[model samples]
Target chain A: AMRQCAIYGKGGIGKSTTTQNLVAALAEMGKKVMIVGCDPKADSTRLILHSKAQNTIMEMAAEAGTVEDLELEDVLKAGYGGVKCVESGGPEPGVGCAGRGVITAINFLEEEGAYEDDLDFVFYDVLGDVVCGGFAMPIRENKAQEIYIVCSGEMMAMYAANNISKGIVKYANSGSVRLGGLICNSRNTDREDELIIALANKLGTQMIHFVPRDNVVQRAEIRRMTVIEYDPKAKQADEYRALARKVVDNKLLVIPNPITMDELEELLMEFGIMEVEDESIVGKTA
Target chain B: AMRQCAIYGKGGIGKSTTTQNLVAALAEMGKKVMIVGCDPKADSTRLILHSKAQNTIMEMAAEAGTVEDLELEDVLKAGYGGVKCVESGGPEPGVGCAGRGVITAINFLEEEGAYEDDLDFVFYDVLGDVVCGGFAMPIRENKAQEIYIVCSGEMMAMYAANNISKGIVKYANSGSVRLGGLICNSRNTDREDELIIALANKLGTQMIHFVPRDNVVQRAEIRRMTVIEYDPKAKQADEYRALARKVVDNKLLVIPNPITMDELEELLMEFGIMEVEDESIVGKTAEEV
Candidate 1:
């Protein structure tokens, strides 16, 4: 059975790089894996395929004038460590929405026979931004059932995690897409591990793995390779391998308790990262 | 009182030109009018304004940020004969939908005071094609009360009239928009007048006017002027004048009987526009049968 995993984070976060490394680890463990890049930037498969650009399902469909003309093999390409890669490329910046491109590509994939019954794992490395209905396509009915949010101890990253969990809460109530865990990609902030663990606790899941700050990640990325593929004996490579192991064996999916903006602030205040402000002194200058 | 009149027709069937002329006729009759073009093409007021385009409400709102930022006067422009012209432009080509643009523009107009107590009529010269909720903005609650469908004796035009009547039937049951009449812009085909009258009768409304084919109309359109303004003494000017008079006096509005496609085919057959073939001789050529 194919276990679909979707990675969500903020726009500039290392979601694609992290997911590609994890997929490379899973593929190294002899698991059949496929990565569907749901970002319009379409860089979700760059590190895996080691190409300038793979022809995306959407780009191919756009080239052929419509989605009706795309063949299954036109989009899917085998990358590093036998991981299948596909990207959903949308319209150029500001012309049309990129989110709808993901929806169109996924729907086309479903209609055309892209998802094979033989595959053991399917990873949807989505764009971290979830602004519209199209970006939330991975978690919508019958798609990605497990979600891992890549977050740091940063306020914006934590806020993004909560927002993504709320999106998951809406779908989790009706469908099966549940919060598996928060995969904390370390920024090495003060009390970073404790804060993310607390954030994940409040979200009703664990910090599945704290991927520590490592320069080797960028080194592997420069060569267009996952650390697991670039150097299997590397410490960061082992961390991703540990992450892939936990994800494969994970049975702890839970409906997340997504917090409001105010509550999230309270949590940050408890961690001493946010100052507890008095309401009367709100607009006062420091 | 602002009497909102929505002109609906099928796509590409000259609804814009007809509505502009009608509004021009209304202006000539000493009425303060506003033409709200609810099409994405934004060409509804182009003929009367003689301006390339009046900056549409949706486009202005998009430029200024959202619906909350737009003022009525920012997009509304006064055209020929003091006619207020506004086009509800949408997103370009295939980005965001144009239909939603119509809805957003109208809602923006309503909230921002486009309809004042001094306006005599607000003619919503809607997009010809009515596909979704965005296209049906005029028929919403407390908007356009009278719908005048522009049609001719052509088959597609007649089908459009029937479809528009069906749309009216839906709105009339809940709101005030009703089928006023079919404005027969004649095609001058054989027995065209009679065919249109029969369609009007079947749809339970009068043929408001048979706007005959005229070269003077073409000449006036080329001059960017209405017949009433260009050549007041012309015979075609009298036709428009008569129609305007009828519009002022006419009050017969009805919920129409929208026929099924099969019934429409039968009606066409009855009008000798189509003939039936023998079912027993199916798949056989006429010569073989």
Candidate 2:
């Protein structure tokens, strides 16, 4: 029973940090897990593996000049709590789209039997800016069935969420891939829990959890480890634990009804994050 | 002569804001200008047009079902100070890469002979992530030869600068494209001007201008206008004017020498932005209960 989920968020949103910490909590509870990082930046598993960027499938394949000649063990590394980590490397900057590499990595994973029968979860940590079809490979190919959008209370974050929701709706309408919920990694906004909850309600999902702002997460990251693994007694550790439990038991998946841009602006205004548009000043200039 | 330039920056770096403000200043001086927005967001020309996102080339073409059926007049809209604006739209989310649309837009502009001899400047406001070949279309295709990177004193911004430098190097080694300079839009870092100047030195470029932070720009933006267009007397407006003059007279362009990750980390430490790495903390966790 593979619980396939993907975490999507804008750059600088701490999506990787949240995913690794939550996965660490799940692993600590004895869940079989694997992480397939789908970004070219490839900082996805740094905290989990407690090191710098791992050797990706593309890099290793390039060295041998054949994906077929490679062994699964050469690509997949067992990290903390035996969680397998593999990164789909991308073309060097200004070359090919990373979507191709991500697909190549997944197909290799499938053919090599890396998707073991004993695995309980596989997480695809993807870049949120879906500029091309290649970046949307996870949702487009139906590899990640459950989508979790990591967002904050910022206006731009919500805009990204709404934009990503449209992508999910496109696949959900034609496939089984469904939006799981919005994961609110707090940016310390006033009434953030309420704001995310309200936005989630509009999108026909739930604000799964509000991981409050804490410095412990950063302290743990400086050491390249998750708070749960580094300091279990830290209050932030329970935050991740709670999030993991929520994701593990989450079943309220839905084909999202994404809101219009005007509605998004309205949502921001309602939460006092953005000022209401003044028609009188529409075209006025000095 | 057409001083064609491209403004490259990561999202939320105020590339659009800075580009529009400077272009407005140039237009105020009666310089003919046009901006080609290469991102899917399509906000590049909003300040110039004084409206929401413009009707992009791709969106208009999809309705006609053919790029050939479209006319230049339908896609090209002249805005504040007569700056021509065109946006290359992307595939509806999760579809084709926006790069394809960008090429199509440029090709159509070329076919229509939109690059007139009278234009003083043509700017391509491009996304800097460069996740794929498509995002790098402007540089790869040599559409924008004079590349100006918008960055600040932030670590990620410099990291982006180095990463983009590598991409520019790939093309600069074989092509005519060269990095013009680094435009430091202030994020109010301590010693930001000095830090960016140092970074630019490392990359073999100059910190062309340090745009100090100001609320007047935002006030102007709220009115859907650039500072130079909205308030000519505001001190920030003159900041952009100075920047416009610098760009107009700029000539020093070169292939970038991107630094390694370790060099980048060391640069941050030298500037007191990042603490020195503790090698001893390589694999430490919590103490035993």
Model 2 chain A lowest lDDT segment of ten: A127-136
**Clash number for model 1?**
0
- Candidate 1 falls in which docking quality class? incorrect
Worst lDDT run of 10 residues, candidate 2 chain B, spans B280-289
Q: State in Å the error of residue B155, model 1.
A: 57
Give the Cα-based TM-score of candidate 1 against the true structure: 0.52
Q: Candidate 1: give its CA RMSD in angstroms.
A: 20.9
Estimate candidate 2's alpha-carbon lDDT, on a 0 to 1 scale.
Answer: 0.86
In candidate 1, position A281 carries an lDDT of 29
Best by lDDT: 2
Predicted complex 2: DockQ: 0.63
Question: Global lDDT of each model?
Answer: 0.73, 0.86
Pairs with steric clashes in candidate 2: none
Q: For residues A121-161, what per-residue lDDT tens digits would candidate 2 score against the true structure?
A: 99999887653677778888899999999999887778778
Please give, for residues A85-181, the per-residue lDDT of candidate 1 as tens digits.
8888743321344446767877877776667647898888875433234456677654888889998887777876876777676665467888889
Q: Which ten-residue region of model 1 chain A has the weakest summed lDDT?
A: A277-286
Off by over 4 Å in 2: A66-69, A282-286
Best TM-score among the predictions, by candidate number: 2
Q: Write the per-residue lDDT of candidate 1 for residues B94-189, one digit (tens) a residue.
A: 124545666777777777777874798888876443223445656755578888888876666776677667767766877777878888786666
